Amino acid sequence: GSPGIRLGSSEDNFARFVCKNNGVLFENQLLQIGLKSEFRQNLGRMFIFYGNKTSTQFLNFTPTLICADDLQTNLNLQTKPVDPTVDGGAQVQQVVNIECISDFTEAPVLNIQFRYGGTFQNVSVKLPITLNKFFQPTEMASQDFFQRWKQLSNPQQEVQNIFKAKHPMDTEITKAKIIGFGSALLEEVDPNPANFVGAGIIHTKTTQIGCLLRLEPNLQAQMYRLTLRTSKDTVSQRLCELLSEQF
């Protein structure tokens, strides 16, 4: 179940890239790995930056993308060559072209292997390409939201999670996290003004999944009740799981 201290692992900062696209994903004493990405419809483009923190250059810098078989059927990644020599204090760029074929839950693994000071260096970090990155936000009037909310048919399409807040509850931050996640934040739809409501469409090559979400805070309990209602059970499950970790 993914045990052990999450420090010096392949995912120490993964969660920091679910609601935003840029920042430092990884950093040891030799290498800094930064990111930027953009997505549109079921496609994306991610730039990975490799910074050499030393006064010595790296040789045979080889970054490779690894996807389990299951992930390869749902997510198509293509990349261009990367300068294999990185000067000390210098940075090199890698471009990853992304095509989402169908919804996916696993994450690609980025493996970095290079030479430094006459030694072999290897690093593996989970790449933050996640399902919500293919969101198309959909603004809509209150009445339209409720009509759609009430069109869910198979209970497997609704997924609910009542969890403990990992972060101080804060209205603006919460709004910011929902917007960053990808869906539209619909103001004043829930009659309870303390709740948040979102809506968007997840885009993939083979199917477009309509998505609705309700987030309910409980200050006393320091918990939230998050509900995902979408047109595909696996999408509800992955979005709920991803979103729950952000609060």
Binding site: N22, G23, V24, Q32, G34, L35, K36, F47, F49
Partner: peptide, 7 residues
Amino acid sequence: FSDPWGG
């Protein structure tokens, strides 16, 4: 544009 190193 946003800084790849700012996050």
